[PDB]
Design a binder for this molecule. Structure first.
Ligand SMILES: Nc1nc2c(ncn2[C@@H]2O[C@H](COP(=O)(O)OP(=O)(O)NP(=O)(O)O)[C@@H](O)[C@H]2O)c(=O)[nH]1
Ligand SMILES: [Mg+2]
Ligand SMILES: [Mg+2]
Ligand SMILES: [Mg+2]
Ligand SMILES: [Mg+2]
Ligand SMILES: [Mg+2]
Ligand SMILES: [Mg+2]
Ligand SMILES: [Mg+2]
Ligand SMILES: [Mg+2]
Ligand SMILES: [Mg+2]
Ligand SMILES: [Mg+2]
Ligand SMILES: [Mg+2]
Ligand SMILES: [Mg+2]
Ligand SMILES: [Mg+2]
Ligand SMILES: [Mg+2]
Ligand SMILES: [Mg+2]
Ligand SMILES: [Mg+2]
Ligand SMILES: [Mg+2]
Ligand SMILES: [Mg+2]
Ligand SMILES: [Mg+2]
Ligand SMILES: [Mg+2]
Ligand SMILES: [Mg+2]
Ligand SMILES: [Mg+2]
Ligand SMILES: [Mg+2]
Ligand SMILES: [Mg+2]
Ligand SMILES: [Mg+2]
Ligand SMILES: [Mg+2]
Ligand SMILES: [Mg+2]
Ligand SMILES: [Zn+2]
Lengths: 129, 313, 14
RNA sequence: UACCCGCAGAAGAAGCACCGGCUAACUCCGUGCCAGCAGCCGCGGUAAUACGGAGGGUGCAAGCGUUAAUCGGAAUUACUGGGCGUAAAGCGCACGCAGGCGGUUUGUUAAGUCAGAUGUGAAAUCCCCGGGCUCAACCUGGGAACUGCAUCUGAUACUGGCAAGCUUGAGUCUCGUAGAGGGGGGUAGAAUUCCAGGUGUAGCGGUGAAAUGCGUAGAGAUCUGGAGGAAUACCGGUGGCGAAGGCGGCCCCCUGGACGAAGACUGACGCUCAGGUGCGAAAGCGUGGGGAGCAAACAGGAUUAGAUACCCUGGUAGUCCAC
RNA sequence: UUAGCUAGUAGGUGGGGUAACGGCUCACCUAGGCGACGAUCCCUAGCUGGUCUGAGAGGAUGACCAGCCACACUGGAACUGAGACACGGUCCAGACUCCUACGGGAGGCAGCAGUGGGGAAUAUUGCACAAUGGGCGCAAGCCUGAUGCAGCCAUGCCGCG
């Protein structure tokens, strides 16, 4: 079903980015806000808005270069069938340090570049390539 | 490698990968064949070397190097197989038949055409005659009197009765004989009553059907007469290869039709729809039976049906 | 292909 | 003993394998699918760099080849890092326990995970910087590593547990609509065959052509009447329904799901499935009925070399129902 | 193509037992115990630090070095002693060989070599306690086929002519 809504979130981003869609909407949650707000601060997307309180609806503004996909590919890493965890020195890089890896720790959701100054490890969410 | 003495011997049988070779005294010694040999049949004299025994007295095989020239040959073609010789180096053929399961006459006529192209004398021999009555025996004897006026010797025997074996042996000495026939016509049983061979195997005999015959015994196994000569068994064969020559040779394949050629109206004649056929006048007179005449044009109409796709050697 | 399938029985080495 | 001095003179000290491609290196002669060669591809019956020999070369080296064994190559049991429409592979289908997994909001726990620290992970081996044996192999100093386990102190985003929820997931009610969904019980009219009667005469029947068979006791054909059996033309269509195999005259009775509209309502009640469970074309089997037509085996006639099959005339089991 | 296994078995009481807890043992009481997270049965195997292979993850394996367990012709038992159910201690049975005056006794190379035999295949029936380590003794000293060595085997690696 919708057992991995983060994988459902990454499905809706990769489709609309490739099919030249201007903006998408999706059901919101606390975890989907904490990931899209990081992608807004890392130049991958443009803006996010929330709509509705009894039915929380998250919106994302897409981003293009000259009509080209900014987010070329994104890869869900951990999953409910197999959980993935790393330490503070085993955090993997994406495209040898070009792409970022979204890792949620006890100090909130940050990147692997931001986790070096934080010195923590935890759950890998997605490889933002 | 490491072969023995080149000598002349008679090949007993054929087994594809190897052959059974009788020496100059009667020693059963199996040998394989040379890769350049195009064909090897039952009862063909060859040049061969019996290998070399690895253990003292215990040898496995030898080789058959060369093949001598053929005196006669029995070549019959087949669909998708080509012209294949069956046997060779023989002076007499014996057509063996039985009343059970059937006794046809078209099976008789095309072995006569083949023997006219090979200068061999076929002999008509009927088996299983003890099961009929004298009313039925006289009718079959009347059907064989047509085959007596055409010059071929007809000897009518039975294996389970031992009737007429002694006149069959006297005309058969000094020669090699193919016991040609169909499936389950008493070929193996007549070999038992004439030879007196070793009764420990003595043949493979399974011919049990509802109205048909079964071919259990294989291609050809060689033996010897108590007087002289050899025997050659035949398979149960229901095949007719007439791809050899022109239909002018079909006119030469029958004995009494030699004396009536050149008597019709035209110099070329199909003898079926042509007006004034003197051969057809000989059948209508009664000197030639109409069973042979109607089967003669069945041979010609069979060549309108076999020739259809194509075949050439 | 499923990891949870290989929990019951691993890949059979010939 | 290592070591060192002194002596004599290049004197005492190089071979094996390969040479078509893979794979470094080419000519000649002999041989004639024979002998042999070979890990693979496959070379040699009259010109073989592939066989044998010579000349020449190549790769190694006091070693050189071969055989056997293990991993690698092989992502060729694919966690990293494979596939399942037709190359090997999605159970015939459905229900469902255990197992795995799970919407959303808040609090709590700190289980999992993460941070730090302690203890421990024997030495040797491997790695880092050195030292030493004339060198190297080898020996050896310290460090790193040994990604491990245990305990304590922390953080709470995610996962787990508890607690309270929420409604878009999944369900419930009403109003409806469509349908060959299944089971049971009746019924209809053609057509087939059988039988009764009437009129009526030489063939009917069958095939490419014939024959078996049937018919002057009157067949066949037609008409009237009756019996039995099974199937439902047209409608009828990549049309509908059912989990699937499948399901079609009409009507009644019992009963299953699917879908649409308007709201109300419970509050994750869910997805999935090893064994297990049930359904499941037709043939066949057991018991007892039933019997038209069709039709294995089989009977008969043609066909044929033989006909066993094809073709034709008959015909049992079976096809029908209950279990 | 192993699904049920188990009656001293699972637990409790008391007695007994060992250096120590304990069905370790005995009488009694309870009917549990184990198990689809592989009980039980069958087959194979000393294990590990490691070595080899591989970019890594993995894979194969456990010779020499070191740690532990087990074994000392086969099977069983106890004594002695702080420590053994004891390789060169004993007792009993069995197997094999040797000695014998025929009644009886003797022996355990999986210790160093070495012979027979097996197999494609693996060594001298050598020297020394000089050193190290252990044993006895106040020490001296003695003993140690541990070990130190030497030879044989291009068996491997490295270096030179
Ligand atoms: N009553 C009877 N039976 C006979 C006679 N001859 C032969 N038979 C029988 O016929 C059968 C056929 O004999 P067989 O020789 O085997 O036939 P075949 O032709 O050799 N057969 P195949 O084609 O396999 O070689 C046997 O069972 C044999 O006993 C005879 O004269 N009378
Ligand atoms: Mg025979
Ligand atoms: Mg060579
Ligand atoms: Mg030549
Ligand atoms: Mg060297
Ligand atoms: Mg091998
Ligand atoms: Mg692999
Ligand atoms: Mg593949
Ligand atoms: Mg396939
Ligand atoms: Mg299916
Ligand atoms: Mg260490
Ligand atoms: Mg150290
Ligand atoms: Mg070291
Ligand atoms: Mg140096
Ligand atoms: Mg939670
Ligand atoms: Mg009707
Ligand atoms: Mg409510
Ligand atoms: Mg039956
Ligand atoms: Mg038929
Ligand atoms: Mg039945
Ligand atoms: Mg007690
Ligand atoms: Mg063992
Ligand atoms: Mg040891
Ligand atoms: Mg012991
Ligand atoms: Mg003992
Ligand atoms: Mg001893
Ligand atoms: Mg020894
Ligand atoms: Mg031996
Ligand atoms: Zn004529």
């Amino acid at each position: 079903s919708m057992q991995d809504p983060i994988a459902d979130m990454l499905t809706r981003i990769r489709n609309g980015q490739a099919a030249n869609k201007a903006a998408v909407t999706m059901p919101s949650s606390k975890l989907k806000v904490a990931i899209a707000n990081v992608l807004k601060e890392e130049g991958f997307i443009e803006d996010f808005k929330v709509e509705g309180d009894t039915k929380p609806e998250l919106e994302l503004t897409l981003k293009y270069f000259q009509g080209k996909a900014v987010v070329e590919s994104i890869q869900r890493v951990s999953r409910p069938g197999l959980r993935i965890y790393k330490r503070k020195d085993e955090l993997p890089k994406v495209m040898a340090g070009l792409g970022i890896a979204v890792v949620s720790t006890s100090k909130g959701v940050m990147t692997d570049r931001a986790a070096r100054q934080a010195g923590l490890g935890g759950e890998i969410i997605c490889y933002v390539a | 490698n490491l072969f023995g003495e080149p000598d002349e011997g008679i090949v007993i049988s054929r087994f594809g990968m190897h052959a059974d070779v009788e020496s100059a005294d009667g020693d059963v010694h199996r040998c394989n064949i040379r890769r350049t040999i195009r064909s090897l049949v039952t009862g063909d004299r060859v040049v061969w070397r019996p290998g070399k025994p690895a253990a003292e007295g215990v040898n496995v095989k030898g080789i058959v190097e060369a093949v001598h020239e053929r005196t006669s040959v029995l070549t019959r073609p087949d669909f998708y197989d080509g012209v294949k010789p069956i046997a060779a180096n023989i002076d007499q053929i014996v057509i063996v038949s039985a009343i059970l399961p059937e006794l046809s006459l078209n099976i008789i006529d095309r072995y006569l055409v083949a023997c006219e192209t090979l200068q061999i004398e076929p002999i008509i021999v009927l088996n299983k005659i003890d099961l009929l009555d004298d009313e039925g025996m006289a009718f079959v004897n009347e059907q064989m009197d047509i085959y007596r006026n055409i010059g071929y010797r007809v000897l009518m025997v039975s294996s389970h009765t031992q009737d007429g074996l002694k006149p069959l042996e006297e005309a058969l000495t000094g020669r090699i004989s193919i016991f040609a026939g169909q499936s389950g016509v008493g070929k193996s049983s007549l070999l038992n009553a004439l030879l007196g061979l070793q009764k420990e195997i003595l043949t493979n005999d399974i011919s049990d059907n509802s109205g048909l015959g079964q071919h259990t015994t294989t291609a050809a196994r060689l033996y010897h007469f108590p007087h002289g000569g050899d025997v050659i068994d035949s398979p149960g064969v229901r095949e007719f290869g007439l791809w050899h020559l022109e239909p002018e040779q079909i006119t030469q394949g029958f004995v009494e039709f030699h004396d009536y050629l050149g008597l019709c109206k035209y110099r070329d004649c199909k003898h079926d729809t042509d007006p004034g056929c003197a051969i057809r006048e000989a059948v209508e007179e009664g000197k030639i039976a109409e069973t042979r005449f109607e089967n003669y044009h069945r041979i010609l109409e069979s060549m309108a049906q076999v020739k259809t796709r194509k075949n050439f050697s | 292909a499923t990891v949870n399938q290989l929990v019951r029985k691993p890949r059979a080495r010939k």
